[PDB]
Design a protein around this ligand. Structure first.
Ligand SMILES: [Mn+2]
Ligand SMILES: [Mn+2]
Lengths: 301, 577, 366
């Protein structure tokens, strides 16, 4: 029935003006999105024309800025690597808009799990407090994290590009393994899924304790071996912040894309996105943050 | 229903808040007599509560003026309201003071002189600063409807509050000084308010000096022109040179309203020099505010001396601020520099502002360029199209391909004016290449702006020139392998369909769209569905049924569910079925 | 003699614009810095050389060199920006201001310095400007302001009431008007020292100071920046007098955050700190209200708050306290703890809840 499609269109139109929905609306949206997300494999096949976008971290105005550069969400295929709930003053609107886009247009947009998309990380940061402020309870927070539990770990664009928010893992050796992992769980603190979302590329030439709490760091040789074994030509990631917004590492065998300009409103990094056409010729579009223009007591409840 | 009165005493915070919200309904059920006799006193004895319940109650007691039997018994709300004004938290204090200000209008003058004035006398004499802060915002509302002796007492109380040693009370008094002086008679203003304003403007803390400067504009408005040079002007001159940057910033921010309130004669002698000093201030924020307010000051200058005063005392400072190190000052100046072109005149604009314009056009700050391009229509009207083309057009074409997309967006959104002014031949000769290249730009927003620009140009220059020049290039852009440019071609066809007319659309736009329907990419397929839904009504029914029907039918069988849905929507809205 | 000291004092009285150009007057700056250092070496070593007439000179030099309108907030202000993440912007003329701070510290801490004479030269205006200066973002400047304010409070007994009063209005302005300040931590450290310096029969002025200044201080969102200092001052005040433990706790419970989880952890940390000092009799007054809030906090889905709440069970003194009060305490902790005991997305919290239940059952069985 198209009545729910029209209601979703109305919801998306409302969210485009940074106006969050109600508790029941978001609950129904997450329940609908879970049905289509649980039907998606751990690694998802992606059509040739697609624009891959890195972390947005709930900067909603910068997300509208991103939509201006790439294009309208239905018109242009979009692929979001992850981390769209924390370090943002508009995280709720950003994540619910992304989820609404995913349910309304499953083919035109795919969202991928990030390290930040987990109860622990979301709570130690402002997303839980944001949900409490904007709804007065943890119901919406619970629905969102339950949905995040169903997000895919990785996506594959025409078998030649590998899209994963974090990095390659020592336990993981081939894509077949990633398909095996059970992703319907909160990020394991240590394990293949953890490293898949927490790892970083570096020039130390080998697996090494990551400066971050969890995961390891993969050397150029590891990336080259992974591409040669899996026949991949390029791996796209977004976990590491890059001041440039796009970064070529490991002899162009890995690319780090950050789509959150002025990260934490303090970094002042210029963001960038990746666009893949029919010939999968990759091109990077860089953009800057969208122009911007007594509080209630914290014990008021 | 009747249980809510007991629920008011229930320990639960949220239930108490809900019962406070329902207080209007409960009181409506109780009736005026029983509400005033029992409910209102109950609230005063049990006022102590969580700050949130206090604020909610103060908001609710506002509409109680009628629920208390009307203004005859509105005094019954004065004791509960007073207790809420005492509450330490600021937000509840503001609601309480607003409620008292609203209630003050309902009271009869004898009630004000007998009940309200003693209440504010008590608030002003409260030991805690909160009472004095709340009382500071009540002298204005109740002053005019009292008697002469009461008015003198109210004035003495306000003088005592102004002379308070508590900085926060002094801040509140300075904030409400202008409002109090509005109601006050001019003779009293000369004798009593002016000393208070002078004392506040010389306070130890700049947080009070800035508020005194803020009220200075109302003080100047109330007084007659001859009194300003003797009562307020020295005070304002001292404030223009105040050490704190905040006082200088407050002077700059309200400079337009100030000079307007002082009139022309005060401005040429006591304010033009101050603005000159303010423009070259050490603090960047003060400079930014002054540069922002430069156009308004230049616009409200006396007609006789405006041109000269801008040429000699303002223009060199504008030239200096054009190359300012700070980016915010340059951006602020660039937003209102075009406003001085109409004032100065065509010859003065081309002689002085054009070099500055060119300099600001090439500036690296994106905000400076965006601000300069946005108001170029003023210069266009002032100097004509010829001088703009001779001077601005190279800058326009250079910025047409600037790195920042927003600058390109601004110039493209302004382009149709140039196209109309220069004529169709000039646009075809020199600017058509840029407009056509704007379509293949990587930024979608630029592409949308280019599509709208195309719609504006073909509606300005007619359908014939559109078909001769623009139609072919767009219909050939379809072959581009990138699907984004195919989306651009479809959007351009959609925009041009309304203006090109039925004949041209059916002749050339339709075959291209039908050919694109068979494109391999689903995104272009459903975009074609959208395009056929948009341009459907323009075409005649015969051509529709002949051509687009089996095309939308074929598209309805596409594997993509989006294409299916959009084809169904198009076939349903156009009733082609 | 002292004439060259005076001449050098006037020489260093000339301000230099480091901000507009670092290179501008580079030799003039280095000469001033070397002269300042020389004057420091002179006051540190030479003794019985601080004469009376140099007091106005040094205080005026400090005023000219230091008292100034602070620059606009470099870090952006708003809910979007975390105060903890504020980048500490330095001050360009720090190579000079730091030496001025050191010289002033050495002058006040010199054994030859006498408060009875300088109390005329240093008046309420000097103290007011000094307190105003606390808003600077530079942490080193704030530290120097803290130590000079502590010295000035320990030396000048006459200004102590005024110094305490001016701290209150800045704190009131901070709580009720601006909610933006950077000097709170240093001011709270000074108070922590003053509170330790208080007398046993606490004056009513200090009682209302604690209840109407230090307690409302918690309500502001910037508490994280300075929370340990506020915790120490409140605990130190309770160490001095046991009777006002009830109001402090009741005011803390009243200002308990409901929308901020980091602030919920800190109020609890502060409450645990308080509970280590509570008297058995004073505990009887707040045993029910405090534990109702703690039971609510245990049930909180936020793991960090719940963690700190359950961390109370590792404190043996608190068990000793609730052992004599278990009769009125178990009926309110038992329901929420048993409800949360069913499941929790965090396994560590589930284990902590099980441990708390086991300890609570073993310590008394009902
Ligand atoms: Mn991230
Ligand atoms: Mn990450």
């Amino acid at each position: 029935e198209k009545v729910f499609t029209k209601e979703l269109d109305q919801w998306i139109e409302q969210l485009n003006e940074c106006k969050q929905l109600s508790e029941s609306q978001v609950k129904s949206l997450c329940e609908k999105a879970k049905e289509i997300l649980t039907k998606e494999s751990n690694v998802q096949e992606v059509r040739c024309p697609v624009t891959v976008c890195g972390d947005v971290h709930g900067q909603f105005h910068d997300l509208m800025e991103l939509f201006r550069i790439g294009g309208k969400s239905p018109d242009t295929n979009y692929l979001f690597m992850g981390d769209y709930v924390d370090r943002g003053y508009y995280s709720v609107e950003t994540v619910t808009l992304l989820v609404a886009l995913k349910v309304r247009y499953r083919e035109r947009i795919t969202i991928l799990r990030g390290n930040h998309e987990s109860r622990q990380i979301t709570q130690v940061y402002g997303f839980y407090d944001e949900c409490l402020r904007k709804y007065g309870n943890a119901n919406v927070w619970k629905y969102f994290t339950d949905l995040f539990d169903y997000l895919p770990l990785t996506a594959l664009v025409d078998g030649q590009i590998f899209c994963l928010h974090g990095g390659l893992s020592p336990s993981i050796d081939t894509l077949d393994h990633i398909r095996a992992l059970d992703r319907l769980q909160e990020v394991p603190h240590e394990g293949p899924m953890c490293d898949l979302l927490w790892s970083d590329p570096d020039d130390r030439g080998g697996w090494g304790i990551s400066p971050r709490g969890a995961g390891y760091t993969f050397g150029q040789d590891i990336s080259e071996t992974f591409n040669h074994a899996n026949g991949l030509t390029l791996v796209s990631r977004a976990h590491q912040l890059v001041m440039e917004g796009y970064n070529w590492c490991h002899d162009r065998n890995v690319v780090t894309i950050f789509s959150a300009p002025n990260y934490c409103y303090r970094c002042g990094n210029q963001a960038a996105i990746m666009e893949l056409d029919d010939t999968l010729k990759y091109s990077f579009l860089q953009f800057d943050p969208a122009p911007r223009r007594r509080r209630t007591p914290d014990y008021f409840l | 229903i009747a249980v809510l009165i007991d629920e008011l005493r229930n320990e639960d915070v949220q239930l108490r808040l809900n019962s406070i919200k329902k207080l209007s309904t409960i009181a409506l059920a109780l009736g005026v007599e029983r509400t005033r006799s029992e409910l209102l006193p109950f609230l005063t004895d049990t006022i102590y509560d969580e700050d949130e319940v206090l604020l909610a109650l103060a908001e609710q007691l506002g509409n109680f003026t009628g629920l208390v039997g009307g203004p005859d018994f509105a005094h019954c709300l004065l004791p509960p309201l007073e207790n809420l004004a005492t509450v330490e938290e600021t937000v509840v204090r503001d609601k309480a003071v607003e409620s008292l200000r609203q209630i003050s209008q309902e009271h009869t003058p004898v009630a004000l002189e007998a009940y309200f004035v003693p209440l504010v006398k008590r608030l002003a004499s409260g030991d805690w600063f909160t009472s004095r802060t709340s009382a500071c915002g009540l002298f204005s509302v109740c002053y005019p409807r009292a008697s002469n002796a009461v008015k003198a007492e109210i004035r003495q109380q306000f003088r005592s509050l102004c002379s308070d040693d508590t900085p926060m009370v002094r801040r509140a008094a300075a904030s409400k000084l202008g409002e109090f002086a509005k109601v006050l008679e001019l003779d009293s203003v000369k004798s009593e308010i002016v000393p208070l304003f002078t004392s506040l403007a010389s306070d130890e803390q700049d947080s009070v000096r800035l508020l005194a400067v803020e009220a200075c504009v109302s003080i100047a408005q109330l007084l007659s022109q001859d009194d300003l040079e003797t009562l307020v002007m020295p005070t304002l001159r001292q404030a223009a040179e105040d050490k704190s940057w905040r006082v200088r910033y407050m002077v700059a921010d309200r400079f337009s309203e100030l000079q307007k309130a002082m009139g022309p004669k005060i401005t040429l002698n006591d304010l033009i020099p101050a603005f000159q000093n303010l423009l070259k201030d050490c603090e960047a924020e003060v400079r930014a505010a002054a540069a922002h307010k430069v156009k308004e000051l230049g616009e409200n200058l006396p007609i006789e001396d405006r041109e000269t005063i801008i040429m000699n005392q303002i223009l060199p400072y504008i030239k200096e601020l054009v190359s300012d190190t700070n980016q915010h000052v340059k951006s602020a100046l660039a937003s209102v520099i075009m406003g001085l072109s109409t004032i100065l005149g065509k010859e003065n604009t081309i002689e002085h502002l054009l070099p500055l314009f060119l300099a600001q056009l090439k500036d690296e700050c994106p905000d400076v360029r965006l601000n300069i391009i946005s108001n170029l229509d003023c210069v266009n009207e002032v100097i004509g199209i010829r001088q703009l083309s001779q001077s601005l057009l190279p800058a326009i074409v250079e910025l047409a391909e600037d790195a920042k997309w927003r600058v390109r967006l601004a110039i493209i959104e302004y382009m149709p004016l140039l196209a109309g002014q220069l004529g169709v031949e000039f646009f075809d000769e020199k600017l058509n290449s840029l407009c056509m290249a704007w379509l293949v730009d990587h930024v979608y927003a630029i592409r949308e702006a280019a599509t709208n620009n195309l719609m504006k140009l073909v509606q300005k220059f007619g359908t014939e020139w559109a078909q001769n020049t623009i139609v072919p290039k767009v219909l050939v852009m379809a072959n581009d392998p990138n699907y984004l440019h195919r989306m651009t071609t479809l959007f351009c066809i959609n925009a041009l369909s309304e203006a090109c007319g039925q004949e041209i659309t059916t002749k050339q736009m339709l075959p291209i769209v039908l050919k694109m329907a068979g494109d391999q990419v689903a995104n272009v397929r459903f975009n074609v569905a959208k395009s056929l839904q948009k341009i459907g009504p323009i075409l005649d029914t015969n051509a529709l049924q002949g051509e687009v029907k089996p095309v939308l039918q074929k598209l309805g069988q596409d594997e993509d569910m989006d294409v299916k849905y959009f084809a169904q929507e198009a076939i349903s809205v156009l009733a082609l079925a | 003699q002292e004439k060259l000291f005076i001449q050098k004092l006037r020489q260093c009285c000339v301000l230099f614009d480091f901000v507009s150009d670092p290179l501008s007057d580079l030799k003039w700056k280095e000469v001033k810095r070397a002269a300042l250092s020389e004057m420091v070496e002179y006051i540190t070593h030479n003794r019985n050389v601080i004469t009376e007439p140099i007091y106005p000179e040094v205080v005026h030099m400090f005023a000219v060199n230091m008292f100034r309108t602070l620059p606009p907030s470099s870090n952006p202000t708003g809910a979007e920006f975390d105060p903890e993440e504020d980048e500490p912007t330095l001050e360009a003329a720090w190579p000079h201001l730091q030496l001025v701070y050191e010289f002033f510290l050495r002058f006040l801490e010199s054994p030859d310095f006498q408060p009875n004479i300088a109390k005329k030269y240093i008046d309420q205006k000097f103290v007011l400007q000094l307190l105003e200066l606390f808003d600077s973002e530079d942490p080193r400047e704030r530290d120097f302001l803290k130590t000079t304010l502590h010295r000035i409070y320990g030396k000048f007994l006459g200004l102590r009431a005024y110094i305490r009063k001016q701290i209150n209005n800045i704190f009131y302005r901070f709580i009720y008007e601006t909610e933006h300040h950077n000097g709170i931590a240093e001011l709270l450290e000074i108070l922590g020292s003053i509170i330790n310096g208080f007398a046993l029969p606490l004056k009513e002025e200090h009682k209302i100071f604690l209840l109407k200044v230090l307690l409302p201080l918690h309500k502001v969102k910037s508490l994280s920046v300075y929370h340990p200092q506020l915790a120490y001052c409140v605990v130190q005040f309770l160490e001095k007098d046991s009777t006002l433990t009830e109001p402090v706790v009741m005011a803390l419970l009243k200002y308990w955050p409901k929308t901020h989880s980091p602030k919920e952890v800190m109020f609890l940390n502060e409450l645990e700190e308080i509970l280590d000092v509570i008297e058995p009799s004073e505990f009887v007054k707040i045993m029910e209200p405090l534990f109702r809030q703690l039971a609510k906090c245990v049930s909180s889905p936020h793991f960090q708050v719940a963690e700190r709440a359950l961390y109370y069970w590792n404190n043996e003194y608190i068990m000793s306290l609730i052992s004599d009060n278990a009769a009125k305490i178990l009926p309110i902790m038992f329901p929420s703890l048993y409800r949360n005991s069913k499941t929790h997305w965090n396994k560590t919290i589930h284990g902590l809840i099980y441990n708390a239940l086991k300890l609570f059952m073993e310590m008394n069985q009902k």
